[PDB]
Coordinates of N, CA, C and O in Angstrom, one line a residue:
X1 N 0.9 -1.2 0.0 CA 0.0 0.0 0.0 C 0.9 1.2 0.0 O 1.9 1.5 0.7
X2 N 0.3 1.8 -0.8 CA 1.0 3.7 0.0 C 2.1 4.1 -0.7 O 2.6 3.2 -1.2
X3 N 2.6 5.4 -1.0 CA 3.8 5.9 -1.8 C 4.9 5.7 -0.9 O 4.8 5.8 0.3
X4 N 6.0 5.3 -1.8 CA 7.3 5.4 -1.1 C 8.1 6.6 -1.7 O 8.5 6.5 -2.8
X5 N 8.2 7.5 -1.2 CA 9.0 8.6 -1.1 C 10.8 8.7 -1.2 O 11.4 8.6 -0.1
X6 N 11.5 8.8 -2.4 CA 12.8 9.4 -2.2 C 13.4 10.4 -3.4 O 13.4 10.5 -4.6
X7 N 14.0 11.4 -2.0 CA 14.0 12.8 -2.8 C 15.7 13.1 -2.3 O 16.3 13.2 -1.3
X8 N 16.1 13.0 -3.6 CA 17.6 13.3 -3.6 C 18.2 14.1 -3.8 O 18.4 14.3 -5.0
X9 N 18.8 15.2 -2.7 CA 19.5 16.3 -2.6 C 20.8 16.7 -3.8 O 20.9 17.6 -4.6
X10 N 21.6 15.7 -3.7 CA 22.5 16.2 -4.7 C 23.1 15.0 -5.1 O 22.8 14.0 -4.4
X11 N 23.8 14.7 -6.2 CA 24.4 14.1 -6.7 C 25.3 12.8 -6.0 O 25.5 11.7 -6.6
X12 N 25.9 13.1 -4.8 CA 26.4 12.6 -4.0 C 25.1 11.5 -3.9 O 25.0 10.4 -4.4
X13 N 24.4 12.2 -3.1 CA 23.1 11.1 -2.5 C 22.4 10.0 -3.5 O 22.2 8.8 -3.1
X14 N 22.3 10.7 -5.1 CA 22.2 9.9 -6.3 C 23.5 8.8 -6.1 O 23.5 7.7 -5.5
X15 N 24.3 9.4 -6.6 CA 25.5 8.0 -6.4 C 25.8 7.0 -5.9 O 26.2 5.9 -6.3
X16 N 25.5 7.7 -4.7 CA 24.9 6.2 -3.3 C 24.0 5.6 -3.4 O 24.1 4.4 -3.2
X17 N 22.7 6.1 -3.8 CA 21.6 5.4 -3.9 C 21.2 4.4 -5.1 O 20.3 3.5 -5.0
X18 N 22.0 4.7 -6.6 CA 22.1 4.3 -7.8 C 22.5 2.7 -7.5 O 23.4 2.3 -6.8
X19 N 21.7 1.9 -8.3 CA 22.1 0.5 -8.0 C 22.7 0.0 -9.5 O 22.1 -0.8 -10.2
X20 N 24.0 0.4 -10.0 CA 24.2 0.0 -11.7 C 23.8 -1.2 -11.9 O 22.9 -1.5 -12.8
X21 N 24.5 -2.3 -11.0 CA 24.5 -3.7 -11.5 C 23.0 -4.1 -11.3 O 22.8 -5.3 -11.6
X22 N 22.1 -3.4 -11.0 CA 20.8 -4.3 -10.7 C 20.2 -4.4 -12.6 O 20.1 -3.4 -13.3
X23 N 19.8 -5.8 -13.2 CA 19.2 -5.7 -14.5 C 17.9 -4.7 -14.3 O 17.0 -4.9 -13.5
X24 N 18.1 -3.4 -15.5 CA 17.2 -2.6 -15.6 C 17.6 -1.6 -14.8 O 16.8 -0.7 -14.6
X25 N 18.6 -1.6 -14.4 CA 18.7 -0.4 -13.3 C 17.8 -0.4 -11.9 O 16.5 -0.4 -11.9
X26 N 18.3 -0.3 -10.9 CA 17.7 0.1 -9.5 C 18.1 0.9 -8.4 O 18.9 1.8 -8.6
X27 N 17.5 0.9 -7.0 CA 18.2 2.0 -6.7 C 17.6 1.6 -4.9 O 16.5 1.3 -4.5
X28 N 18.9 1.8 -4.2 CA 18.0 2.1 -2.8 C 17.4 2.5 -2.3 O 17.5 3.7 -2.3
X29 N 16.5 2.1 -1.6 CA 15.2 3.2 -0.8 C 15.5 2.9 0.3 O 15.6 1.7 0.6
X30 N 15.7 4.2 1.4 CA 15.8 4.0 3.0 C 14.0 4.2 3.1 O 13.2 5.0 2.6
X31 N 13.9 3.4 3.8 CA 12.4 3.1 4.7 C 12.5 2.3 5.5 O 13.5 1.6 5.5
X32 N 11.4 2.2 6.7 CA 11.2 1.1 8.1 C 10.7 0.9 7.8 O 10.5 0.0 8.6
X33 N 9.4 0.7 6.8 CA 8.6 0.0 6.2 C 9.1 -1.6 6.1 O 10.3 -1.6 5.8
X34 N 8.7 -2.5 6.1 CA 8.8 -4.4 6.1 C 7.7 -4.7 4.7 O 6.5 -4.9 4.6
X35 N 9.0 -4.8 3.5 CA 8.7 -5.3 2.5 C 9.1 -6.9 2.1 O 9.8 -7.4 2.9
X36 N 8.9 -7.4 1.5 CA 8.8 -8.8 0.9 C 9.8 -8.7 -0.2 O 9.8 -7.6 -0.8
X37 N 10.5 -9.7 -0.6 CA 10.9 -9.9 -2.4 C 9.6 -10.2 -2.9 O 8.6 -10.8 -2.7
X38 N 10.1 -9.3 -3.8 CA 8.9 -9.7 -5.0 C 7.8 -8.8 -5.4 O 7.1 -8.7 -6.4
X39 N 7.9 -7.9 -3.8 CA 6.8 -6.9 -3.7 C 7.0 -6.0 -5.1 O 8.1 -5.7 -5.7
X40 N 5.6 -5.6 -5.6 CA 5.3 -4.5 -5.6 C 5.4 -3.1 -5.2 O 4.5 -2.7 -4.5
X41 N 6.1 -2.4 -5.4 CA 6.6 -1.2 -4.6 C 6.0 0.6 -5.9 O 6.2 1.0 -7.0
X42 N 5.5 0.9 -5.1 CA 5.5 2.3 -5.8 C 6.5 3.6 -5.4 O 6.2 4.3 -4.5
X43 N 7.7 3.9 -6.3 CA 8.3 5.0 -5.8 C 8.0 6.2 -6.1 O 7.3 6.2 -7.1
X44 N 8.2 7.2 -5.7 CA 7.9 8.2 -6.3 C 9.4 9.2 -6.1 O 9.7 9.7 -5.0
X45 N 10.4 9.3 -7.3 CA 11.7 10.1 -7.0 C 11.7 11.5 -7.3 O 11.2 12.2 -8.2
X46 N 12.7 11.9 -6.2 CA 12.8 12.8 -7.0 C 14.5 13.1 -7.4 O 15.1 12.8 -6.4
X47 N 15.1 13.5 -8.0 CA 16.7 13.6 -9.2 C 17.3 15.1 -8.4 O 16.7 16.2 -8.3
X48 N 18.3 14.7 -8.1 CA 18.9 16.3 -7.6 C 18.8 17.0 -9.0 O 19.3 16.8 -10.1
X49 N 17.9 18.0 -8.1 CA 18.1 19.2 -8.6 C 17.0 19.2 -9.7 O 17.0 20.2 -10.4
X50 N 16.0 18.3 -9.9 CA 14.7 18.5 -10.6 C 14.0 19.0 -10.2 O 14.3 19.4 -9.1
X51 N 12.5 19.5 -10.9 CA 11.5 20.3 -10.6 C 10.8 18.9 -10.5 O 10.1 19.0 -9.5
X52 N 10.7 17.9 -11.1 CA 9.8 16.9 -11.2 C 9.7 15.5 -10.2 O 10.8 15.3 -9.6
X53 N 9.1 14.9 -10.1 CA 8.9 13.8 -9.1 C 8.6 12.5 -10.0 O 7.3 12.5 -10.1
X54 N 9.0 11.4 -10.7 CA 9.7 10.7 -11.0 C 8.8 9.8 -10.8 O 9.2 9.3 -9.7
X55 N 7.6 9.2 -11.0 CA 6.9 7.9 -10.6 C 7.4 6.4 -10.9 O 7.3 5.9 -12.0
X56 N 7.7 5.9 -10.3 CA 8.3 4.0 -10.9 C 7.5 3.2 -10.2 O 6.8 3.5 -9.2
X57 N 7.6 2.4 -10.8 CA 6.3 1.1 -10.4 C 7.4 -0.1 -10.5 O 7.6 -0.7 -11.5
X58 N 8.1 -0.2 -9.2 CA 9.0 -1.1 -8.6 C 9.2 -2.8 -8.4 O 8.3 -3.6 -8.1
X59 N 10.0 -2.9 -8.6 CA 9.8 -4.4 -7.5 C 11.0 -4.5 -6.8 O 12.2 -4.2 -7.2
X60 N 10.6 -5.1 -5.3 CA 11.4 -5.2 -4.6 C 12.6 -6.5 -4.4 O 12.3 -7.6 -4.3
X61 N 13.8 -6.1 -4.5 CA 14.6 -7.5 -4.8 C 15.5 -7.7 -4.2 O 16.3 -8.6 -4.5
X62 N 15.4 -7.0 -2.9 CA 16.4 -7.0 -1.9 C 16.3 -6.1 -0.2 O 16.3 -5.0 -0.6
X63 N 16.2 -6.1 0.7 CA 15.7 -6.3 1.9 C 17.3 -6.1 2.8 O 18.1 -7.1 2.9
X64 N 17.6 -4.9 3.5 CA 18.5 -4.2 4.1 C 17.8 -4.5 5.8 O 17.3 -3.6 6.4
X65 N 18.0 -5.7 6.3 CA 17.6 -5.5 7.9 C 18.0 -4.3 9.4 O 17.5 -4.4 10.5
X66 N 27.1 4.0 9.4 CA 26.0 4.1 8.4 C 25.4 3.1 8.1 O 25.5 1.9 8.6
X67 N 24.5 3.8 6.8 CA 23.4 2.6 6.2 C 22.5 2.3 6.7 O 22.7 1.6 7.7
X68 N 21.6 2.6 6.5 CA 20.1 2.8 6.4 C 19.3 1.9 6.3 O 19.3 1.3 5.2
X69 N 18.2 1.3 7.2 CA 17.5 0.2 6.8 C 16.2 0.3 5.6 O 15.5 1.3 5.7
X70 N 16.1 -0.2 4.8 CA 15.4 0.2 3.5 C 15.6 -1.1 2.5 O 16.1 -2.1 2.8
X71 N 15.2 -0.9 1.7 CA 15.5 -1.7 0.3 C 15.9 -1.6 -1.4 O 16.0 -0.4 -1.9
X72 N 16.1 -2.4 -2.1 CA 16.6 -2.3 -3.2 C 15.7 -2.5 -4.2 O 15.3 -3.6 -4.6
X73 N 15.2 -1.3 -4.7 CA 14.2 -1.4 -5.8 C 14.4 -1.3 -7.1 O 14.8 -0.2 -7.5
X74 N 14.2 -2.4 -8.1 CA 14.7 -2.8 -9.5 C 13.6 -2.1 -10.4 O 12.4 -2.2 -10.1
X75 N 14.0 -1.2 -11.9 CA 13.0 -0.8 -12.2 C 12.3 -1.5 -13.1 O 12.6 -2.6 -13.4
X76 N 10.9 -0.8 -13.8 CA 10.6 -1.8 -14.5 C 11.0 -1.9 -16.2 O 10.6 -1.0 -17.0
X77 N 11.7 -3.0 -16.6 CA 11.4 -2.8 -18.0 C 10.4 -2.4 -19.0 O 9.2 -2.5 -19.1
X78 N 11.3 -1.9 -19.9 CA 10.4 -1.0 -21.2 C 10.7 0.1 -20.9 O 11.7 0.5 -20.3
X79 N 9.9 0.8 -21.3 CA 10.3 2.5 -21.6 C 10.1 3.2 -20.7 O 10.9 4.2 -20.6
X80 N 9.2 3.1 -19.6 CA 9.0 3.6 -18.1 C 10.3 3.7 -17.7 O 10.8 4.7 -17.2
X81 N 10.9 2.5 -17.8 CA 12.4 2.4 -16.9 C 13.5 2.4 -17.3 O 14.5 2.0 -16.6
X82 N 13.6 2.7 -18.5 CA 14.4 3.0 -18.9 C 14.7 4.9 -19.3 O 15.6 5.5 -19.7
X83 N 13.2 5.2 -19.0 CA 13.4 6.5 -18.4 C 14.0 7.4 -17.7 O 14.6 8.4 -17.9
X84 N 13.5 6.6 -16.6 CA 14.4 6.5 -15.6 C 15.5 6.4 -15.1 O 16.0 7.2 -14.3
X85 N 16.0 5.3 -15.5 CA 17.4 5.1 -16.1 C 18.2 6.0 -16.4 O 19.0 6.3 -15.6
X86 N 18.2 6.8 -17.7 CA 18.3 7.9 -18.5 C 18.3 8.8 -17.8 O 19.3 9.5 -17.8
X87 N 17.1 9.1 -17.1 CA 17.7 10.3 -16.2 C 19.0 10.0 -15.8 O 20.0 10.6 -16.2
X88 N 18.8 9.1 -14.8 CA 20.3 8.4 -13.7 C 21.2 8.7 -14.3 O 21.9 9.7 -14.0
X89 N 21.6 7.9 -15.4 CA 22.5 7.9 -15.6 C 23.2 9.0 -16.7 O 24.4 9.2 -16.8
X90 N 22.5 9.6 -17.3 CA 22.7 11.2 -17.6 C 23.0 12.1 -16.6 O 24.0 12.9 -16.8
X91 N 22.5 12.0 -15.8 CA 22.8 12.7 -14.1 C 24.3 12.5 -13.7 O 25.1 13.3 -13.3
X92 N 24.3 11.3 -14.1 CA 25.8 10.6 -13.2 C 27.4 10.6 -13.9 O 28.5 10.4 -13.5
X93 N 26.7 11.0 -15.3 CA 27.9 10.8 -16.5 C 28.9 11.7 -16.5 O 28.5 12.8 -16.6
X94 N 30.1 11.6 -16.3 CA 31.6 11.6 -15.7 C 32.1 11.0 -14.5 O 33.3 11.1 -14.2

């Protein structure tokens, strides 16, 4: 149920959060929230330094019991997420 929220300050925070090796690209979410593999997850991001908020329709593929308890959300293939993607890694290029 419910939006999951992550709003990334700057670049730094992007980098850390950026998951390359996940297929399709993914990305950490800090939450206390208790998710499942496999879940269903709705993010809603936001990109340092955007005006926009980023909707992805997630799955969860990994489970974090520094460092932040949270999880690892994979995006979805096709063009949604690789949108997304695109942002990232446009963002991140150098």
């Amino acid at each position: 149920q419910g939006i999951l929220s992550l709003a990334l300050k700057d670049k730094a925070a992007l980098y850390s959060a950026y998951m390359p090796f996940v297929k399709s690209g993914g990305i950490f979410v800090p939450t206390p929230k208790r998710y499942m593999l496999g879940d269903e997850v709705f993010l809603l991001l936001t990109l340092p330094d955007s005006s926009e908020r980023l909707p992805v329709a997630g799955k969860v593929v990994w489970t974090t019991p520094n460092r932040a308890a949270g999880i690892g959300v994979q995006f979805p293939d096709g063009p949604e997420g690789e949108a997304v993607r695109n942002k990232i890694e446009t963002l991140l290029a150098g």
